[PDB]
Amino acid sequence: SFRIEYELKVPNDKYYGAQTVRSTMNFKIGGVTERMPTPVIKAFGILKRAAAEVNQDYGLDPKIANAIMKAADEVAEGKLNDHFPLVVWQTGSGTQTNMNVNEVISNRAIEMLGGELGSKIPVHPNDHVNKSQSSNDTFPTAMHIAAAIEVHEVLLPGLQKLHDALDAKSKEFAQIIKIGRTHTQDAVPLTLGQEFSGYVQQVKYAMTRIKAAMPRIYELAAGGTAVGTGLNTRIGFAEKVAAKVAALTGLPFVTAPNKFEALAAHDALVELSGAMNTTACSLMKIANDIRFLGSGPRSGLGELILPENEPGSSIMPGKVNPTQCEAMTMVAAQVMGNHVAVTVGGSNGHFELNVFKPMMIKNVLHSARLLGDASVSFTENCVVGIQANTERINKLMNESLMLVTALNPHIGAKIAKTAHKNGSTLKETAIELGYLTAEQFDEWVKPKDMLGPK
Amino acid sequence: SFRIEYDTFGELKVPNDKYYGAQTVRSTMNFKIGGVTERMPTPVIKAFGILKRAAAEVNQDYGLDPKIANAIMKAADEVAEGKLNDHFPLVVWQTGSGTQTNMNVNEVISNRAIEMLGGELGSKIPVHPNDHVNKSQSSNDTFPTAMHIAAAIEVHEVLLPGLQKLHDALDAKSKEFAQIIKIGRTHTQDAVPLTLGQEFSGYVQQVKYAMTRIKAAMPRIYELAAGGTAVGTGLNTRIGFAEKVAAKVAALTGLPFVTAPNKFEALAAHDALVELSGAMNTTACSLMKIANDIRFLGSGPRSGLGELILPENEPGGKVNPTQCEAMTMVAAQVMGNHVAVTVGGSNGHFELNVFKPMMIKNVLHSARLLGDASVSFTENCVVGIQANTERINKLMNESLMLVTALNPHIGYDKAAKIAKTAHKNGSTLKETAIELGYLTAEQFDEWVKPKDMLGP
Amino acid sequence: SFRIEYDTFGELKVPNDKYYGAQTVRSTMNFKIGGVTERMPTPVIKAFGILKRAAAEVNQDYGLDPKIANAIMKAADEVAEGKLNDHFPLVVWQTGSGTQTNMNVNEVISNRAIEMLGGELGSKIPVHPNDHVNKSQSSNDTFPTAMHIAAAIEVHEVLLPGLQKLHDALDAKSKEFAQIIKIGRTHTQDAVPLTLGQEFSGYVQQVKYAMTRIKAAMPRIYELAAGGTAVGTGLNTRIGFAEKVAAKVAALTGLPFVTAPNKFEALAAHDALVELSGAMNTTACSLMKIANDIRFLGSGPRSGLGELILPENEPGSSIMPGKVNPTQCEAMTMVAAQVMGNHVAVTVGGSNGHFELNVFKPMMIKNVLHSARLLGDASVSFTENCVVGIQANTERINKLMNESLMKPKDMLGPK
Amino acid sequence: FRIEYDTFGELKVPNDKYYGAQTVRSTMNFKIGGVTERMPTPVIKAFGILKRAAAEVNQDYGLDPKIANAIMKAADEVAEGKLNDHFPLVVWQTGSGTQTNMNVNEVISNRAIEMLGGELGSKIPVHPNDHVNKSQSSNDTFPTAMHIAAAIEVHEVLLPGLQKLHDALDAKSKEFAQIIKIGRTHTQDAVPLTLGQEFSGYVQQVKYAMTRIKAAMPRIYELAAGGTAVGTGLNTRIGFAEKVAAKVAALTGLPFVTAPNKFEALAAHDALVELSGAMNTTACSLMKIANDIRFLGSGPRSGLGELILPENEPGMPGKVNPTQCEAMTMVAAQVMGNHVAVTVGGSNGHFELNVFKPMMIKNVLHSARLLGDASVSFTENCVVGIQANTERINKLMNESLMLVTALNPHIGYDKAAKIAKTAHKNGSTLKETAIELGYLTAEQFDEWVKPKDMLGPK
User: Fold this and answer.
1) Which of C372, C404, D117, D176 is in Cβ range 3.0-4.6 Å of D196 for a Cys bridge?
2) Is the peptide bond before D125 cis (omega within 30 degrees of 0)?
3) How far, in Å, CA of A160 to CA of A312, rounded?
4) Which of chain A's residues have a Cβ under 8 Å away from the Cβ of C210?
């Protein structure tokens, strides 16, 4: 079932039009997995909604405006995602997605007003849906709205859950004393609470970093039009559209103070990617630490008992693996690659317009989503159920050579050397040698007194 | 609308219209990372259907009942053929060995094979997901096997044929523009002449060499881990199984799959994937250059360079080099993907690298993007490019680079005087030569011949 | 002429004209990786001078004899002031805690302080490298402290002043060019008008935003690990040492250093360096764009765009009349590509901490300092040898207006 | 000081230096990054080789043999590292490296003039451009020097370092061939493999690194010389390109050839990206090897403790830091960032000339030399002295609950899993549990559960 638009066949069941069909014919790169990410499309919904309402100030008939507003909300609410077939690998201004949005909002609005789909009557994609706007200033506007929403709704709440779970564990483990490891080698004592407090600070700081990388994300290009001058838009449009987006989202969007910078570069997305990159480094460390600390159960480090969620092996009967650590550390690796892709696009602006926009936002949204979702999965399915193997930890304290120093201000090396050579404990050796009693060793050597400055 | 199934952790509801089982349901519950766009790539799923098909045939030499084997071979074929893709809901961001996808595959094939035999789905009867579908295998050696199969098919069916179109199209264009002389540019400044054909021949060479680089990075992709089992020893597999399955995979694909000579290296690392991603990274550099040049050479129509007229396939009356944009975006993405692969590859622990899903996702992503982009750039840009000869001819006549042609005919000092004079006055060399009185228009035309400025 | 010192593996000749000792010599043998270009960065050595100077003055509170502390303070100052650079032969590619450089520092300062007090070089008397120079310290908390001191100082003295000069020169040119109307380019295609001042204002905003980004990426660089000792607990150090040492370093430098609130996080990761590198990475993206634009806009003399006349910085060629190569554009864009690579190196090291200690420390600071210095110096060089000398070809800019297919004075803002 | 001149004013040139006015102006105009950023000596030496080859060939094209002879001698001195102090320029110069080409022409001119008994700074009788640069461009000489430098560094530094490490790892693999250890997958206790088998994996990775690097070398052997300004070879003599490549081939003993397409050779440095690609793979391999050895040597008592690594530091008693593992893993991380640098430069060619050349070759050489030296140092100071803790290895392996895998073909997966879970709940042996469970006799367990039988297929 098709309709003719114009000279192109458009499926009768689709709201897009000829310019979207036109764009599908020539950009068949990577197929449907490569379709423009949903948050971009939704963000466009919010944009076209904002612009339509504001445009009533500049001669937009309220009947048309209201229908566009309603159609856009449907877009923004993810109700019309099947009407967006274009890939990331399209024109690098993202204009083809802008046209897609205009066409879909036009035809849904037209339907709503009882017109014929494809007619451009009474809602015209360019004259009404794109009123006061351009390709060059719309896609970057959507990018930033989409990035900020993803950070506030997915990324930061994920991190917060992780931070809170780690902090709870740190408190739970505050009196559990284990052997430090530096260079992977046995080192002086600290609590599991202390070590976990390190992970907490890193996630606290990851969140601080991401927040720090947001102010320029809230700057919107809308109003720059073709080259940043604002040619062919109305005075005040730029500001009023930013403000409507802010009020619709509850986020502090403002018009970009320099539209040339806003269109010719996407340095804010590179900045935000940079924050996610630091965050990936932090999470790699935390998840890899917990992976190793949970290793065994018998012939690894064995300090942590990680929740068992599924079987690990068809051959090795009863094996269970730290599979949440793995998804998280894989996501961390992906984010680091995503960042280089964003950097290469960001660096490759030409004169008035950076035309790597779709790829940059694809990578930013992918990193943000992966990090947010992994942080929740890792929290709910690993961190919250972590228990300490205190038997193992306690045995490893009593079997370590790192406590020998406690005896220095009592008896004055040979214990440690002999214990090391004989394979025995510090206590066993001290007694075998006859330098102290079993009661004495217990008096002198108190690991709870080895956990701070004196 | 659900049936009840079981694994060793216990009982789970599975939707009646799905061939997967309890461990797949379990994975969906525990790995909610990224959503549907993050599903295990289809090439890995199809590759698994190839492998399981191969395993099931060979396993008849090791006891597997023919009735069971046949059914398994037919199910696995439907997986390989892309008939069962909706029965694979699991994401890339799962266990780092890809075990959960292995189990997805075992379950989907087990159930389709049971249905073909009129058994009850989810019963493990008569085709058990582990004891039959996964006979003589481990997640540890099967997921690497599927990766390399997937990788090789994508290179052979998508990447290389894409690059071949592009090579051939650039080379035809090189030939077509062999007689068109333009001003070379070095540091972006006017240099000395070369033909448009010569310039395009550099691109042809770059693409030829990209293909050679990809092919050079393939030998260790053909090495399959299958047979290493849990840690690379082959524990619980019969001798000969490694080699028989690798050969069956070769015969099923027409590609030179062989058994990895060191199964520890094959499980503990995915250096071959890093190598291949490396070749694609070079290819992305070559393509960035070609497509950026073509973009700039087509710039204008009036205040750019304006040497090439690129096909107008859509509206910008404005129209933009939109295929060059797609392609240079793809190229940038490949470079990022390459770092993701390298970080994953760098991070093996002891007997198993557990970054496998992420590594093959990026390699496959890069291969499909480069291949598809190459076809699109060829068909929708390269083949239609025309030279704006009226513009190129006008720029030749207005360049100051040709004045050295006058040296032997009038001396260096008069030749230098002309360039300096035309430079200050904004005039042609010829105008200034004639105005200064050093020569006639007829002498200037006989003396300054850019076609004699094209070789040693 | 040499002296003989010993370490746990043997006697060693130490040249009598050097203030380092046995441990340094042994490190030169055991880490023969890369050569003289790979030497630990001078800013790290200098930052060690400041740190050991602070620790020595502070350690008087915790029993360090004043005559020993004063010699150590003096000798440390000479290290900090760059008077002893030749006594640090060690490469970046050493232990990942940078222990050997801490030992280098301790040895050098010991032997210079010994000499000031009139003792025998190589003797550990009366100034002992571990017991006095390293007093209250660990290699694990000293190298991170020196890294952050080095990075902040390089950010303040080199990177930010470099970018400031560039911002100011671009802005000057934006103003100078504010009334020159040119053709905009989008997708490289001819577009609607903008001024050259307008286009240049984009570049000015980018550099302003770069400095903003870099300053935003500093707060956690000011946190110092000193006091965390071996694993973060501060075991075997004295209560109040962490704070006193950070406060002394803050007074010594005039930068706002503080003790890291969480020492485990301070030792186990260098996420602040990754953050700072990320800001330089964005800056590199900005500069790549500015420098490449200026490159293309200056193209010609007749087959390019020809909007800008760039100052000549090379001899002319007779074979190519009028060719003027954008030399600083090339210097800057190479530097930009370099910072992007360096950032990946920092990221990989950052990601690879183990338990109580990240042992990728030397390479992470080397990359950070490399990027900072290249960006600062390239920003000053690009300013003084390109930007300030830029002229517009108003004849050609304009002629390509009455030639464009796109009153232009009435097309530069909204209606 | 002597006085010399360029188009921008008078320049003092130190009497004790062989460089000239263009070099001096370059030190003034490219003050980026300081001394560590000086152009790599391998590049300088490689230019020595090229200018030696060019001088000898140019005797076919009008070069006075007296002059040529003196240029050859001076060029040999550069190539032998006798004149390193006369190259003050940084990597961060023009993107074609023209200032280094100028530096080399000035130095060779002046040292040649001094050999002929003329005046330093005079361009008489050896002109830096008319003689030392005869038949050459700035645009084809720097790429030629890049590839000569890269090829030499691969053959003299990188491949021999890797070879040594390969041989040391293979020796250790043989030494450990009968030590049965526990495999770890996902870091979890697994089934046995020998320590020799685990080390055989490292051995294969280094073998393959060397194969990868050699596979990435063919297009590095391609030389741009003769391409001149844009690839066309305008203003050079026919046969110069072929003759200089052959002379470079002959001087070095490496299979250098002329680039079959000079446009590709000048407009891109894809071969450097390719070579860097091979080093990046190599870095992943070394990261894994060095990280494993690090972790395997962890202890003395709260780590894995399977390996005893050599002491490289003063003595926390018993603590032996894996210092070489640390140097090697830092180096591996650096090669990965360097690869990005090379990639960004290589991606950014314009029209007839890629102007990222100095940066690209600096990163390639930096990666080759760090990998080569680190591999030697890792071999000599770690790998050759590695010992096994056989007592600890044995106990760690015997304790693995996943030895129960042995019982699969005898009693089935489900009953092996119950043995394992209940051994893990109770803290019992596998044997104590299976006897108590009624699943096997003590004797059937001993005959079914034998680690020395789990090392290969049935």
Assistant:
1) D176
2) yes
3) 29
4) 267
Assess D32–C contact: CB distance below 8 Å, yes or no. yes
One-letter amino acid for residue B254 of the chain = G
Return the number of other C-beta atoms located less than 10 Å from residue D237's C-beta: 17
List the one residue out of A391, B367, D313 whose CA is nearest residue C102.
Answer: D313
Question: Rounded to whole angstroms, how far apart are CA atoms B287 and C57?
Answer: 60
Residue B26 class from Cβ within 10 Å (0-12 exposed, 13-18 middle, 19+ buried)?
Answer: buried
Q: Rounded to whole angstroms, how far apart are CA atoms A211 and A271?
A: 11
Angle among Cα A355, A357, A361 to the nearest 5 degrees reads 165
- How many Å apart are CA D357 and CA D268, to the nearest integer? 9
Cα D26 from Cα B126, distance rounded (Å): 81
- Chain centroid to CA A330: 13
> How many beta carbons lie within 10 A of that of residue C291, not counting itself?
24
Q: CA-CA distances (angstroms) from residue D232 to B208, B451, D237, D264?
A: 20, 12, 11, 11
d(CA D204, CA D198): 10
Largest CA distance in chain D: 102
Q: Do D316 and A400 touch (CB under 8 A)?
A: no
**C-alpha dist (Å) from residue C126 to C66, C114, C117, C288, C327:** 12, 6, 8, 54, 55
Token pair for B261: 């000579």
CB contact under 8 A, A277 and C282: no
CA atoms within 13 A on the CB side of D63: 30
- CATH numbers and ranges of domains, chain B: 3-137 (1.10.275.10), 138-401 (1.20.200.10), 402-453 (1.10.40.30)
Is B362 known as a binding-site position?
no
Q: Find residue A371's DSSP bridge partners.
A: none
- Contacts of D443-448 with C-beta under 8 Å, sequence gap 24+, read D444/D410, D445/D407, D448/D406, D448/D407, D448/D410
Hey, is A152 helix, strand or coil? Answer: helix
Q: How far apart are CA D329 and CA B246, in angstroms?
A: 34
Query: Residue D169 is encoded by which pair of tokens?
Result: 């790892």
Q: How many other CB atoms are found less than 10 A from the CB of residue A52?
A: 28
Bridge partners, residue D193, by sequence:
D181
D75 close to D106: Cβ distance less than 8 angstroms? no
B178 in D contact zone (CB under 8 Å) = no
**Measuring CA to CA, how many Å separate A103 from each of A72, B77, C410?**
11, 42, 32
Q: Are B243 and B143 in contact (CB under 8 A)?
A: no
- A340 interface with B at CB cutoff 8 Å: yes
8 A C-beta contact, residue D350 and residue D268? no
- Residue B11 sits at φ, ψ, to 5 deg, of -100, 140
Catalytic residue annotation of A: 183, 313
A204 alpha-carbon distance from chain centroid = 15
The reply to whether B301 touches chain C by the CB within 8 Å rule is: yes
Q: What is the resolution of this structure in A?
A: 2.0
Distance CA C374, CA D39 (A): 15
Q: Chain D: residue nearest B233 by CA?
A: D456
Written as one letter, the residue type at A27 is: F
CA distance A77 to chain C (A): 32
Length of chain A, please?
A: 454
What are the distances in angstroms from CA C243 to CA B337, B411, C221, C265? 44, 79, 16, 17
Residue B292 sits at φ, ψ, to 5 deg, of -65, -45
> How many residue contacts between A and D have a Cβ separation below 8 Å?
133
Method: X-ray
Confirm if A290 and A300 have CB atoms less than 8 A apart: no
Nearest CB neighbour to D330, from listed C9, C93, C331:
C93
